[PDB]
From Swiss-Prot, chain A:
UniProt protein name: Small ribosomal subunit protein eS4
Keyword hit for Zinc: no
Name of the gene this protein is made from: rps4e
Species this protein is from: Pyrococcus abyssi (strain GE5 / Orsay)
GO molecular function: rRNA binding; structural constituent of ribosome
GO cellular component terms attached to this protein's record: cytosolic small ribosomal subunit
Swiss-Prot record, chain B:
Annotated GO CC locations: ribonucleoprotein complex; ribosome
Coiled-coil spans in chain: none
Protein family (similarity comment): Belongs to the eukaryotic ribosomal protein eS24 family.
Top-rank lineage group of the source organism: Archaea
TM region positions: none
Gene this chain is encoded by: rps24e
Xref: InterPro entries: Nucleotide-bd_a/b_plait_sf, Ribosomal_eS24, Ribosomal_eS24_CS, Ribosomal_uL23/eL15/eS24_sf
GO BP, one annotated term: translation
This protein's record includes keyword Ribosomal protein: yes
Protein name: Small ribosomal subunit protein eS24
Curated annotation (Swiss-Prot), chain C:
Top-level taxon of the source organism: Archaea
Annotated protein name in UniProt: Small ribosomal subunit protein eS6
Annotated family: Belongs to the eukaryotic ribosomal protein eS6 family.
Gene Ontology CC terms: ribonucleoprotein complex; ribosome
Keyword Ribonucleoprotein in annotation: yes
PROSITE patterns documented for this protein: RIBOSOMAL_S6E (PS00578)
GO molecular function, one term: structural constituent of ribosome
GO BP annotations listed: translation
SMART domains associated with the record: Ribosomal_S6e
Keyword Ribosomal protein in record: yes
Pfam families listed in its UniProt record: Ribosomal_S6e
Keywords assigned: Ribonucleoprotein, Ribosomal protein
Curated annotation (Swiss-Prot), chain D:
Cleavable signal peptide: none
PROSITE patterns: RIBOSOMAL_S17 (PS00056)
Any single GO CC term annotated in Swiss-Prot or TrEMBL for this entry: cytosolic small ribosomal subunit
NCBIfam families for this protein: PRK08572.1, uS17_arch
Protein role: One of the primary rRNA binding proteins, it binds specifically to the 5'-end of 16S ribosomal RNA.
InterPro entries: NA-bd_OB-fold, Ribosomal_uS17, Ribosomal_uS17_arc/euk, Ribosomal_uS17_archaeal, Ribosomal_uS17_CS
Protein keywords: Ribonucleoprotein, Ribosomal protein, RNA-binding, rRNA-binding
A biological-process GO annotation: translation
GO molecular function: rRNA binding; structural constituent of ribosome
Family of the protein in this entry: Belongs to the universal ribosomal protein uS17 family.
Assembly mode: Part of the 30S ribosomal subunit.
Record protein name field: Small ribosomal subunit protein uS17
Length: 242, 96, 124, 107
RNA sequence: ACCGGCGGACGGCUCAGUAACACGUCGGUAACCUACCCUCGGGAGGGGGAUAACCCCGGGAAACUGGGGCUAAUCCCCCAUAGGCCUGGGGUACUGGAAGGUCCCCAGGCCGAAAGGGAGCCGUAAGGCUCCGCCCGAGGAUGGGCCGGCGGCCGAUUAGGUAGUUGGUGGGGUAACGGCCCACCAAGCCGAAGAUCGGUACGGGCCGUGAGAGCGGGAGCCCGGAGAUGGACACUGAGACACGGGUCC
């Protein structure tokens, strides 16, 4: 990139969280800017063609997408470069199937089949919170989306809390606090894909990140970064997890 | 030659069904496309006009070959989806 | 000095070309761009050429011209000399690209014997 | 007042806008501890820290030293020979990128 | 075919220069920019103008290029409102380890938007109903800029080097911090633990060899850097001082 932004992406330099054959061809799809980040998302074309196998070539995959056969979080997506990330819901209504995108035990993205009723709710982690003109509170979630709340409820929401949002209407229906005894699911790091309950929280000076301790089902304790812990329930998960 | 069906899958999005099969034929040459298509349409009650044989492949020291084919429910959909070259190769349409 | 004259009628959009040389052409030498001169003084059968009745005392003003090598005249350069300057638009340059500039050779304002074509328009 | 270091602030105040305790300066990044070895220029000190480097082939150690120039607020005013604590900030001059925040042991 | 929009700054090639924050690695930006993309909150009122294409006449050996007539737009220009930026005085609503930050109220100024446009149906018509679009604000994402600590060649038959040089105060300039550049005040800064100068060379993941410890190389594939006959300098643009764009020697 001597004079401007990059537009291409070699197969060997593709993110390590995809299921893709790195030596079969030369090029890979460079994802469009969108909801999640590079390390936690995958272009839609690979979902249509490689994962589910509904298409054999890229050309016929685009014909499927242009007809509006795929729903991501309840909205039609036609761009084959659109990124799909953690906790998203992929729905095919014509075949009546639904999946949730989750990291594997080794850090790769997989599709987890889910019920139809569960397909209407998406958990969003409150990543940041700020004041906005007219004296309102804006919440910025982990997938880049935003929400507005009045000044009256400023004490019901804090960072690292989880909000259950009904899609595609984007309506709040549940708030899960981040506290001792809450049920969490790890999304990155060495202990990815493990789940459990919070035991302790530690803090450090000069802006180092804070750590949490989690007890799993069998009673073992392990530590991880606080921002890598995703709250999913009070004492039991509210969503299906593998 | 003996034809054995391995798997049949339904693709509602495209609007077609995909067929994988094996052909057992010791001491005989690789079967022609016409013979395989005739045998398949006889075996599964398919309209021959909307049936495309994607490929027939032989192996090094085997007595059997592997084949893959597709069947469309509508002629216009087949013309709209399939590449031109495969239709010419299968004799469905005439080359210019 | 022989001049090839292009007389344009603005009231109809039709133009005519005649060749003028001799003492009459000597009168035209020295004028800049943007000044009138009666055609009768120059001496021309205006009505016969255009096949149209014309008002009396009509005069024509100098609009442009080209030299014997094909270089044009630019109204914003004083004097009769020929120069080579960097241009971005205006007469004597067609850009073809946004923000493009190129070095071109042009003439000046004053008419000189080197000029061959002279474009003028009728002013009723 | 607290700036995230969890140490005692200086005794008195100053008017320097570049003082992290009383001005507008912000600190973020690495924090080091060292010995002052020069204070000739105005509001500037040189701090030296020593460490050991391991030579893999000869399986032995050698001593190396690192020298850093730091800003010296008037409210602290460190001198030659004492232990100081320095923190990283935005660039302040051609060679100054740290500021003294505490004197741990006066000479 | 022409006007208009987007792209042509990626990709492709080579290793001349460079011993340096160029590269590897851990961190920072509360000191910064970002067209295309995602979410949320709002807006689209009133006027004006030229010209290509097209017709008449051409100039020049050509490369190129002149005058006159006529016309449209998601082309161009104004007015309003929204909005942005600077400084002074108050209140403490937010994030964060910590506010020259964000939010609210007064006051003086400067800058200052938009295309309800296009396509299809039901409409006798009236008007809907989808699809693609235009502008402003808050955040993200993508792609970058800048900074710091540590790590990796040879020479003493090169021992002293530096004078905007090192730091301070007050400014300018930049997207942004900074001797980056000025005015003024001081005498600092580096060095036998090898400065300065000279030689050689793009850095790394890696590759060859050996029981190992080591010794030698770093063209081909990936990531980063630099260049377009040599040396200097600009226009447009979100992004260049631009390999198939411009100017000088
Ligand atoms: Mg390029
Ligand atoms: Mg070289
Ligand atoms: Mg205006
Ligand atoms: Mg080397
Ligand atoms: Zn102080």
């Amino acid at each position: 990139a001597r004079k401007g932004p990059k537009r291409h992406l070699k197969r060997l330099a593709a993110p390590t969280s995809w299921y893709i054959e790195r030596k079969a061809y030369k090029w890979a799809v460079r994802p469009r800017p969108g909801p999640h980040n590079m390390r936690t998302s995958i272009p839609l074309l690979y979902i249509v063609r490689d994962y589910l196998g509904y298409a054999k070539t890229a050309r016929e995959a685009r014909k499927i997408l242009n007809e509006g056969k795929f729903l991501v979080d309840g909205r039609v997506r036609k761009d084959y470069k659109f990124p799909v990330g953690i906790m998203d819901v992929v729905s095919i209504p014509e075949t009546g199937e639904h999946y949730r995108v989750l990291p594997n035990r080794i850090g790769k993205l997989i599709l987890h089949p889910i019920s139809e009723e569960e397909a209407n709710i998406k958990p969003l982690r409150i990543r940041n919170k700020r004041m906005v003109k007219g004296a309102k509170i804006q919440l910025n979630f982990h997938d880049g989306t935003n929400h507005l709340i009045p000044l009256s409820e400023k004490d019901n929401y804090f960072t690292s809390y989880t909000v259950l949002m009904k899609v595609p209407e984007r309506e709040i229906l549940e708030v899960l606090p981040f506290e001792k005894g809450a049920y969490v699911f790890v999304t990155q790091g060495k202990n990815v894909a493990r789940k459990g309950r919070i035991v302790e929280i530690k803090k450090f000076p000069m802006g180092w990140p804070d750590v949490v301790t989690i007890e799993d089902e069998e009673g073992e304790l392990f530590d991880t970064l606080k921002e890598y812990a995703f709250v999913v329930g009070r004492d039991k998960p509210r969503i299906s997890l593998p | 030659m003996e034809i054995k069906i391995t798997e049949v899958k339904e693709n509602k999005l495209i609007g077609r069904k995909e067929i994988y099969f094996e052909i057992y034929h010791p001491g005989e040459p690789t079967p022609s496309r016409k013979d395989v298509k005739g045998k398949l349409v006889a075996m599964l009650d398919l309209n021959p006009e909307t049936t495309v044989i994607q490929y027939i492949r032989s192996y090094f020291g085997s007595y059997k070959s592997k084949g893959y084919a597709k069947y469309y429910y509508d002629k216009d959909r087949m013309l709209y989806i399939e590449p031109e070259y495969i239709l010419i190769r299968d004799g469905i349409i005439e080359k210019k | 000095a022989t001049f090839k004259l292009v007389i344009s009628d603005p009231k109809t959009g039709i133009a005519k070309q005649i060749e003028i040389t001799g003492p009459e052409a000597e009168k035209l030498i020295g004028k800049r761009i943007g000044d009138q001169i009666p055609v009768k003084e120059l001496g021309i059968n205006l009505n016969e050429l255009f096949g149209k009745e014309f008002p009396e005392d009509v005069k024509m003003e100098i609009r442009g011209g080209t030299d014997k090598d094909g270089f044009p005249m630019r109204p914003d350069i004083h004097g009769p000399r020929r120069v080579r300057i960097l241009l971005s638009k205006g007469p004597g340059f067609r850009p073809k690209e946004k923000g493009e500039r190129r070095k071109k050779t042009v003439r000046g304002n004053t008419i000189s014997p080197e000029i061959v074509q002279v474009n003028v328009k009728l002013v009723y | 007042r607290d700036i995230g270091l969890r140490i005692q602030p200086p005794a008195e105040k100053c008017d320097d806008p570049k003082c992290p305790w009383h001005g507008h300066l912000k600190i973020h990044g690495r924090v080091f501890e060292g010995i002052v070895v020069s204070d000739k220029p105005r509001k500037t000190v040189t701090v030296e820290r020593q460490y050991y480097h391991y030579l893999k082939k000869y399986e032995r150690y050698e001593l190396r030293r690192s020298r850093i120039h730091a800003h010296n607020p008037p409210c602290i005013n460190a001198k030659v020979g004492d232990r100081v604590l320095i923190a990283e900030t935005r660039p302040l001059s051609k060679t100054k990128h740290f500021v003294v925040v505490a004197v741990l042991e006066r000479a």
